Amino acid sequence: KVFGRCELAAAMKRHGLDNYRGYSLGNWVCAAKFESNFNTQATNRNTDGSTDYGILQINSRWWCNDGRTPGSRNLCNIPCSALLSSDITASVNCAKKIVSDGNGMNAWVAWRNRCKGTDVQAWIRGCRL
Template sequence: MRSVLIISLLSCFFAVYNAKVFSKCDLARKLKAHGMDGFHGYSLANWVCMAQYESNFNTRALNGKNANGSADYGIFQLNNKWWCNDNKHSSANACNIMCSKFLDDNIDDDIICAKRVVRDPNGMSAWVAWQNHCKSKDLSKYLASCKL
């Protein structure tokens, strides 16, 4: 039993240790390369601002404490009730992907799903952090020091 506990603790440490945390400029470059600047009318700064407040740019961010029992995954905190399947809860799985894919360092699939999210009528308002911290704000500081 003791060895199981030690292995579990070490694997948690390894997962956190291997998390990729983007700088805002590195994330902006990646998002721009994937056509996010202006996607469905949202500037690149909106995406960077949202990612900062949702995950602090951490690809392994996991929030399992939503009031409705759902969880949010990855750099964009994509929800398991609507966007991905975690095999634990009922899900619309609109992005047709396992939630665990949003916890790796390759954010290409996260970006594809985020694009799917904003195509819905709520747009970026699907992210509460974007509504509270980014919507209708001067976001110039998010890209000011980036050489895009």
């Protein structure tokens, strides 16, 4: 599924991400934009052989099992394919674990490089939340 901007904002809002660990909603929408272009089916292979999955490009190196990332962990205790659903629940639940873990939203490279230190409020402008 390719989410609309406000459609995803609203979905992230009702799943409790607005100001979760102090990260306003715009940060989560900005992250999803530049990780997946709002596409729940997005997958990308990393140079080390792990793969990033779904709307927030969650990495098989640490967070989910895809059975083809040798030596990796599955900290969210879920198959990586579950993170590709049209329903973002699994990605959000795993994201909440990731963001509570140490370096916060810096765990998302696209957030660090394209959202952090910018005005992200624009990402939820005009949305019914």
